[PDB]
Design a protein around this nucleic acid. Structure first.
Ligand SMILES: [Mg+2]
Ligand SMILES: [Mg+2]
Ligand SMILES: [Mg+2]
Ligand SMILES: [Mg+2]
Ligand SMILES: [Mg+2]
Ligand SMILES: [Mg+2]
Ligand SMILES: [Mg+2]
Ligand SMILES: [Mg+2]
Ligand SMILES: [Mg+2]
Ligand SMILES: [Mg+2]
Ligand SMILES: [Mg+2]
Lengths: 177, 116, 75, 136, 50
RNA sequence: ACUUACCAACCCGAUGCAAACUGCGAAUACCGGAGAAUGUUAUCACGGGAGACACACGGCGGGUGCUAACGUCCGUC
RNA sequence: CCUCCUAAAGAGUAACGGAGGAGCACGAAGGUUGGCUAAUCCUGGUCGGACAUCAGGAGGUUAGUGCAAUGGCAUAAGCCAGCUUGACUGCGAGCGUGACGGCGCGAGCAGGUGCGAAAGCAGGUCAUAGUGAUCCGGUGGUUCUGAAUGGAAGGGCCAUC
RNA sequence: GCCUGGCGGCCGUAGCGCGGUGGUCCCACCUGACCCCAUGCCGAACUCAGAAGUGAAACGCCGUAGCGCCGAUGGUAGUGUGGGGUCUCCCCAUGCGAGAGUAGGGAACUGCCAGGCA
């Protein structure tokens, strides 16, 4: 919501000038945020994953996408077709709205917050952090839990380098140790 | 790959209209404009065309690139086609769905007397 | 352990270049589209190319893959 | 005793051994042993010539073997009649054509190298000849 | 092999039947398909799977 | 975690091999068309009568065997 | 019976030659419309291991094909979904392959259907294996025949076992 | 005449790559999404309504032989016919003659219709 307009009004100015760009559309703009939960253990019982799918759907507005395994890997006894995950891809408003619901409301709730990394930037300008317990996000109630499954988040961008990739998130109050 | 994706999506119908030896009314669509050519079976020569990037029919449109602009181009190209003597053609959506602007263009040419 | 074989299928080209075929005439018996069908050539279920028109067999290489095509030119 | 680690098929047709060789120039060393004649070189033969090479030269220089016995040869054992399937692989040969460099050597003078190959050549069933590296 | 031969029987009272095969252990329901009957010369629902 | 006289794939450069390898590729042979000379229609079709279906050596190309056999199995002359 | 090699660049071609498969499966894994495009490695990321899932990148089919191998396959024949029964009936120009029996390919026609806005596609499945002559019977259909005549029996014909 | 777009021919001397370059128009991203239609989540794609903004991405054009690609001449190999030998392999006469490679080329060419600046 605000971070769309605060991106336009404020964050673009900071990046437009401190990277000495020559056109507005050069400025790295967030395209999508993907929330993923490699479910793993759930290959025994189907229910373990659907508890995790509803877990994903409370964090975000929209409902998730029960993935498959694409192939067979006997190292964890899986096969082409059996679900081994679930995800969401957030774009437009819910993307930004999630971004406020995370940076300002969940990012303030870590066990011994020591800062945050700046090396999980993927080498082409996309950040991903992954957390360890579902409850950190507000819409997961602390009492309605059955097992502690974290997830993985990936802020993808129209950036090129991890350099300006940092510049964008650094100009969003995003934590960096 | 949005460009190439459409061209590969259009190939089977296009290649099939070659083998059937049928003049095909091609349609090109852009977020602004809409286009239409009646192309001979060799694929290498237009007979008749109409489009919103003109002036003869673009002043009569609120915005080029809507279902009513398409209808104009659709009604236009059929009229131009029926002067030259061209009545039986095959529609080539060229990888766009037959849903809105294309369906508008194709539905108008039908009423104007093009057999498809 | 090594004494079996299949009866031979008599595949390959039956009508060569410039050969005047009637419609229906099989031109190639093949496994797959080693040759593809061109003008007035049909591709059957077993992928054999046959003539749809009376005329002259014409082999040609066409397209961005340099695929081998067969057509009948009406004489 | 050289042999393929794995092969696509166990048994190979007899084939024929026509033509001039490929691998006709010295490519890795200064000196080499070149075949003049034609015929099969068995793996035992290649190891024996190599054994004699490396002893005529004592820990001196480097030796390359340019041939590989990749062709399996079969033999019906004694007292088997004709037929009843193809025989069992008994040894591995390299087919040799006139011109093939068989071994190469550097790190030693020529004169020691002429002597090393002469001893190795006595182990082989093919006429050979000493040869040197050539520029362009 | 496993799969067993069946006759698909015309509902048009003609007596005309097709023949095909079915796996009975899997898909144990009655195969119902619309098929051309050449006595009344129409497409017609056929019904049987043994 | 430090190293390791052992080992080390992928990639790069160089060197070869292949009946069941081919990003190349002949000569020949085969199909078809045209044209001339040439040849006792040498061609095809239908019909009457058959015999024959143990082959052999040689050359070429090969399998098999030992590129052994006046050996064995194909192709072609 | 199928595939490759032997097999000598048309076909065909033998050995107690070399190597592998088949005796099925499928009412969807078939038809059609619409849509999509792999393997593998790299970088980074919760439980994560060298390999689950996510994102990008390089890669360009080094994958995939219900099952061998070969030839094919991006206009995909490969993955997904929607609607469906053309896995239609009668025929069939003409070809191919066979000593024959036979096997195979097949536009197009008639009738009726499905998909699709339409052009069109569909007479089973990417193809090539997945099979068994005749006799004797069985079942259903069909008033063809019906040993004086009317019927019936049996026979024939069509479909199938 | 120059620029753009659509359709083709041709199918790498046509491709990748690299460096530069273009926004009147066209094209691209782009803005928004009650309704049409859509996501096995997502207006990302499909799609409809639009035109503030940018030519960043893409695309196109221009340039540059790092690569791919094309590619002689000559020789080499093989081979039909005939002949011959020291015959598991070769040679001779004649005809056909590669592949690899070398020099070298090479930053496609061309058509139809449309539009736009001149
Ligand atoms: Mg006999
Ligand atoms: Mg005999
Ligand atoms: Mg004989
Ligand atoms: Mg004999
Ligand atoms: Mg052959
Ligand atoms: Mg031959
Ligand atoms: Mg019909
Ligand atoms: Mg199949
Ligand atoms: Mg009866
Ligand atoms: Mg009586
Ligand atoms: Mg009676």
């Amino acid at each position: 919501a605000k971070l769309h307009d605060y991106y336009k009004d404020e964050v673009v100015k900071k990046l437009m000038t401190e990277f000495n760009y020559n056109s507005v559309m050069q400025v790295p703009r967030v395209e999508k945020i993907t929330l993923n939960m490699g479910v793993g253990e759930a290959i025994a019982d189907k229910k373990l994953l659907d508890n995790a799918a509803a877990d994903l759907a409370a964090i975000s507005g929209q409902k998730p996408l029960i993935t498959k395994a694409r192939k067979s890997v006997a190292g964890f006894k899986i096969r082409q077709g059996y679900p081994i995950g679930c995800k969401v891809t957030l774009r437009g408003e819910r993307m930004w709205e999630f971004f406020e619901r995370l940076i300002t409301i969940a990012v303030p709730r870590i066990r011994d917050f020591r800062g945050l990394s700046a090396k999980s930037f993927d080498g082409r300008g996309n950040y991903s952090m992954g957390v360890r317990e579902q409850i950190i996000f507000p819409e997961i109630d602390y009492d309605k839990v059955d097992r502690v499954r974290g997830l993985d988040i990936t802020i993808t961008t129209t950036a090129k380098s991890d350099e300006e990739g940092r510049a964008l998130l650094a100009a969003f109050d995003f934590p960096f140790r | 790959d949005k460009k190439s994706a459409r061209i590969r999506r259009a190939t089977r119908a296009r290649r099939k209209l070659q083998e059937l030896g049928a003049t095909r009314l091609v349609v090109h669509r852009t977020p602004r404009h809409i286009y239409a050519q009646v192309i001979a079976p060799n694929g290498s020569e237009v007979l008749v065309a109409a489009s919103t990037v003109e002036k003869a029919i673009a002043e009569q449109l609120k915005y080029t690139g809507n279902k009513d602009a398409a209808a104009a181009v659709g009604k236009a190209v059929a009229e131009r086609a029926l002067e030259k003597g061209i009545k039986d053609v095959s529609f080539d959506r060229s990888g766009f769905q037959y849903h809105g602007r294309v369906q508008a263009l194709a539905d108008a040419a039908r009423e104007a007397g093009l057999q498809f | 352990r090594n004494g079996r074989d299949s009866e031979a299928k008599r595949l390959g080209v039956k009508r060569f270049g410039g050969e005047s075929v009637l419609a229906g005439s099989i031109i190639v018996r093949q496994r797959g589209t080693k040759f593809h069908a061109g003008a007035n050539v049909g591709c059957g279920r077993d992928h054999t190319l046959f003539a749809k028109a009376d005329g002259k067999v014409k082999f040609e290489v066409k397209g961005p893959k340099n695929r081998k095509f067969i057509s009948i030119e009406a004489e | 005793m050289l042999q393929p680690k794995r092969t696509k098929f166990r048994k190979m047709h007899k084939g024929r051994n026509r033509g001039l060789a490929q691998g006709t120039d010295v490519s890795f060393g200064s000196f080499g042993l070149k075949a003049v004649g034609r015929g099969r070189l068995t793996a035992r033969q290649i190891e024996a010539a190599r054994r004699a090479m490396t002893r005529a030269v004592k820990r001196q220089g480097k030796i390359w073997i340019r041939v590989f016995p990749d062709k399996p040869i079969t033999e019906k054992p004694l007292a088997v009649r004709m037929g009843k399937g193809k025989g069992n692989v008994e040894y591995w040969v390299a087919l040799i054509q006139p011109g093939k460099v068989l071994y190469e050597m550097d790190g030693v003078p020529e004169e020691l190298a002429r002597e090393a190959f002469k001893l190795a050549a006595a182990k082989l069933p093919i006429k050979t000849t000493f040869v040197t590296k050539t520029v362009m | 092999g496993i799969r067993e031969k069946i006759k698909l029987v015309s509902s048009a009272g003609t007596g005309h039947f097709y023949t095909t095969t079915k796996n009975k252990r899997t898909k144990p329901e009655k195969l119902e398909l619309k098929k051309f009957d050449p006595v009344v010369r129409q497409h017609v629902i056929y019904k049987e799977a043994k």
